[PDB]
Design a protein around this ligand. Structure first.
Ligand SMILES: CCCCCCCC/C=C/CCCCCCCC(=O)OC[C@H](O)CO
Ligand SMILES: CCCCCCCC/C=C/CCCCCCCC(=O)OC[C@H](O)CO
Ligand SMILES: CCCCCCCC/C=C/CCCCCCCC(=O)OC[C@H](O)CO
Ligand SMILES: CCCCCCCC/C=C/CCCCCCCC(=O)OC[C@H](O)CO
Ligand SMILES: CCCCCCCC/C=C/CCCCCCCC(=O)OC[C@H](O)CO
Ligand SMILES: CCCCCCCC/C=C/CCCCCCCC(=O)OC[C@H](O)CO
Ligand SMILES: CCCCCCCC/C=C\CCCCCCCC(=O)OC[C@H](O)CO
Ligand SMILES: CCCCCCCC/C=C\CCCCCCCC(=O)OC[C@H](O)CO
Ligand SMILES: CCCCCCCC/C=C\CCCCCCCC(=O)OC[C@H](O)CO
Ligand SMILES: CCCCCCCC/C=C\CCCCCCCC(=O)OC[C@H](O)CO
Ligand SMILES: CCCCCCCC/C=C\CCCCCCCC(=O)OC[C@H](O)CO
Ligand SMILES: CCCCCCCC/C=C\CCCCCCCC(=O)OC[C@H](O)CO
Ligand SMILES: CCCCCCCC/C=C\CCCCCCCC(=O)OC[C@H](O)CO
Ligand SMILES: CCCCCCCC/C=C\CCCCCCCC(=O)OC[C@H](O)CO
Ligand SMILES: CCCCCCCC/C=C\CCCCCCCC(=O)OC[C@H](O)CO
Ligand SMILES: CCCCCCCC/C=C\CCCCCCCC(=O)OC[C@H](O)CO
Lengths: 155, 156, 156, 155
């Protein structure tokens, strides 16, 4: 357990965490037609805070191993597109563009998890709930568009 | 040390996230009414600079990712790119100039940290980041001047 | 290592310059209309904190000034005290919040530099500066919140 | 010549240099009754910039010698009161208070110069024009008060 590595990766998640703190959910979001499986509002901040620590802990393990350059490249890509999604969806209200963002993020989270598994099982296991949540996030962006197609922001 | 296209294209794909933040910007009536300093470049200069910096920053990361002990450097690199993606929505989207100044300063320190850690592992990877740190210092100054030369309403 | 009163009284006399900046302040209608954060202390707390910090900072400098190789540390110390004297006229006098934030950040880095250089020469001199760095971090945050929670007119 | 030392001391003079840049001379200042020996406006920014480099160069020499703690203490005191004067005189228009500030500064500049002479002649020589300028500055504050006593700001 490298504390210098871990605190850097967790500080890196201060950028996506900042997007949530400055763009909390708004009536626009609560006026949208949600699917039947939409969870209560408290689920989302708890999930992201859990993932920030898990992904940071996983990256710290990988960053100590030889040949981890590709994995950390995948890790930098997923986190960037992670930071990108919330301002595109909540801030700009561009749902169709946000769907492309979250889908690219999903591919990079899946890539990071696979690359983590090739070097360390536990780092891969820690990313498994991240890929599950990303599938959830992709589904919500798709449903937000498909059940609200009558708005210009959805297309 | 090879030109690694799998590494290079991943870091370059990573720079698609901040590039989209710029691409989704409309010519703003609020931005062009702001009192800018005399050394503020025209708006078209910024996308040209960022595309060059994306490649320099991508090539530098590609070199470092092939060397042993690069974990800390790439950690600084992931943080630098994350806060880079954060600035443009905070400044242009939310119009929070004071918050955007704090973001760009966090970005600057992580750019400086990445460059220092890169120099410890590879001189050329460090050299490639020098124009990134120069532009980041320049970018911080513009956020500072934009705030003090204009009216600022209380942030949300 | 002695209690050196010639050294101690000089550093304490030096802290008379920032202390006068506080002493020459009138209860301001502009300052008390500003939207402050919930953790902003009442106005009377600040002169009490500064007087304690002046003595801690003076005693720490007095210890360092007796040791060999302290030139760099005392250089950081002179810079820290100079920018400390600068902040209060920039914030309260000129009402330049954005400029005052840059000043207090320069002060913070020189406080952090002095504490690091003090630790390299004397542990207790470094320990005495820890509450100074904590207060400086706190002071930076208030300047940041004062700016983003209020209206800011363009600076002169 | 220690470049790390010299650049720190010169950066320290960025605080008093900032007071001048943010509080340039104003019509209030040009309406005051000045003595006959008042120099043109260009003399003052040139003098202070010259003194900033000279005092920084002098302090760097002293900071390399053993037993310089007292001198650098005097140096920190003069620079603090140097930073204090311009906001009290120009900013607050408190001429009487500013006279006490500049007089305390004068005593600390004289003390720094004497302490510099005890350790290194050249550091003392570099401070000699600083003490001359401080005497000039004290005289201007006194004359500003004595030839403008009919204003509340002068008393
Ligand atoms: C929104 C779209 C939804 C699409 C539907 C979901 C698709 C899930 C596929 C995941 C890729 C699985 C990759 C994980 C394979 C890595 C395992 C591996 O080969 O590594 C060796 C072993 O782990 C050494 O420990
Ligand atoms: C290599 C990159 C891989 C990732 C790139 C992925 C790009 C996907 C873009 C989708 C834009 C929106 C198109 C899909 C819109 C479906 C929602 C919808 O239109 O709702 C259906 C209907 O309108 C309601 O009845
Ligand atoms: C409007 C302002 C526009 C201009 C903005 C001002 C630019 C200031 C930034 C300079 C960064 C240069 C950093 C150079 C330091 C790196 C050198 C180095 O440390 O090399 C290490 C060595 O090679 C192996 O350890
Ligand atoms: C509203 C906010 C109020 C609170 C503000 C947040 C406080 C953060 C500052 C911490 C400074 C502590 C610095 C401690 C580091 C010094 C320890 C050290 O380096 O010791 C060296 C060693 O003893 C010999 O080399
Ligand atoms: C506004 C008030 C105006 C008042 C009128 C002006 C008074 C000038 C007195 C200066 C003190 C002189 C102190 C300098 C003496 C230091 C010399 C010394 O003893 O050091 C030994 C020698 O220099 C080893 O090199
Ligand atoms: C240890 C500390 C040593 C330094 C402490 C020094 C304190 C000096 C204070 C002076 C305040 C003003 C008093 C002098 C005012 C003279 C100007 C004046 O009054 O003008 C004369 C007359 O009014 C016009 O005709
Ligand atoms: C603000 C904008 C300022 C920046 C504008 C820059 C424009 C591009 C200029 C020169 C290209 C230099 C590219 C350098 C390529 C280095 C990559 C490389 O050489 O790859 C190493 C590989 O291992 C082989 O051995
Ligand atoms: C496509 C997928 C991989 C190839 C890498 C290409 C990704 C390159 C990112 C494009 C970029 O960052 O620059 C965009 C340009 O500035 C205009 O917006
Ligand atoms: C915004 C538009 C740009 C973003 C759109 C998404 C772009 C992502 C596509 C490709 C990334 C690079 C893919 C190359 C990774 C393959 C490497 C790999 O999987 O194996 C590693 C090993 O080192 C091999 O030799
Ligand atoms: C090292 C980084 C190099 C950056 C230089 C590239 C573009 C700035 C030039 C345009 C500046 C225009 C100023 C406004 C006239
Ligand atoms: C914390 C570090 C942030 C420091 C960021 C560096 C801030 C430098 C600001 C700057 O150099 O601005 C250029 C100047 O305004 C041209 O006239
Ligand atoms: C924000 C406010 C927080 C700070 C509030 C502090 C209040 C004072 C508390 C304790 C006094 C500690 C004084 C420590 C004295 C150390 C000086 C000393 O011991 O001198 C060394 C000499 O060499 C002998 O050997
Ligand atoms: C008198 C000369 C030397 C003794 C040192 C005493 C100088 C002590 C400075 C007083 C101080 O800094 O605190 C003032 C207090 O806060 C109220 O304004
Ligand atoms: C704002 C109110 C406060 C400011 C008002 C001005 C205060 C300056 C007075 C005394 C400083 C300390 C004087 C003690 C210096 C004597 C030491 C000395 O000259 O000799 C050095 C040697 O180390 C000895 O043993
Ligand atoms: C280490 C530095 C210690 C500083 C603690 C001293 C004063 C702050 C306490 C007052 C805070 C009031 C908060 C507003 C209620
Ligand atoms: C450059 C360094 C300036 C960094 C100064 C440190 C800024 C910290 C700001 C801070 O900690 O503020 C407290 C926070 O707002 C409580 O809620």
């Amino acid at each position: 357990m490298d504390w210098a590595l871990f605190l850097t990766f967790l500080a890196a998640c201060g950028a996506p965490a900042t997007t949530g703190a400055l763009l909390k959910p708004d009536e626009w979001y609560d006026n949208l037609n949600k699917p039947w499986w939409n969870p209560p509002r408290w689920v989302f901040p708890l999930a992201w805070t859990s993932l920030y620590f898990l992904m940071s802990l996983a990256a710290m393990r990988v960053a100590q191993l030889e040949g981890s350059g590709q994995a950390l490249a995948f890790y930098a890509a997923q986190l960037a597109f992670n930071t990108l999604w919330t301002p595109v969806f909540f801030g700009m209200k561009r749902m169709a563009t946000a769907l492309a963002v979250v889908m690219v993020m999903w591919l990079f989270v899946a890539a990071t998890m696979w690359a983590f598994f090739q070097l360390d099982t536990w780092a891969g296991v820690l990313f498994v709930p991240y890929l599950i949540w990303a599938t959830f996030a992709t589904g919500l962006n798709f449903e937000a568009m498909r059940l609200n197609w009558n708005r210009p922001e959805a297309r």
